[PDB]
Amino acid sequence: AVKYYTLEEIQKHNNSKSTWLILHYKVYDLTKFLEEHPGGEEVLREQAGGDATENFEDHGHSTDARELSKTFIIGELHPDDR
Numbered sequence: 001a002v003k004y005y006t007l008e009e010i011q012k013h014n015n016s017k018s019t020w021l022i023l024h025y026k027v028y029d030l031t032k033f034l035e036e037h038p039g040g041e042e043v044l045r046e047q048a049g050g051d052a053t054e055n056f057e058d059h060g061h062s063t064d065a066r067e068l069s070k071t072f073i074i075g076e077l078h079p080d081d082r
C-alpha cells in the first residue's frame with residue numbers, strides 16, 4: 001500500500017509541529033529527531049518541506065541513518081504533484 005501526502009501538506013509540515021521531507025519521493029516525518037540529529041534542526045528544517053533527497057545523499061549518510069529514514073517513512077509525495 002501507500003499513504004501519500006501532497007506538496008501542499010509537505011511544504012506546510014515545516015515548523016515545530018511536524019517537519020516533513022522528500023527522500024526519493026517517499027515522505028519522511030521526523031520532528032522529534034530534530035533534537036537528536038548531529039546536523040541539527042535549522043538546516044534540516046530549511047530542507048524540510050521539499051526534496052531533501054540530493055542533500056541527504058550529498059552528506060553521505062550512514063546505513064543507521066538510512067535505516068532510520070525507513071522507519072521515518074510516513075508518506076509519499078503525491079502523484080498529481082511529483
Ligand code: HEM
Pocket residue numbers: 021028030037038039040043044045047052055056059060061062063064065066068069072
Ligand atoms: C531521514 C532523516 C535523517 C537522518 C536519520 C539523519 C541522521 C544523521 C546522523 C545519524 C548523522 C551522523 C552521520 C551518519 O550517521 O551518517 C547525521 C549527520 C548530518 N546530517 Fe543527517 N539525517 C537525516 C537527514 C538529513 C538531511 C536531509 C540533511 C540536510 C539538512 C542532513 C544534514 C546532516 C549534517 C549537516 C550532518 C553533519 C555531518 C557530521 O556528522 O559531521 N541530514 N545525520
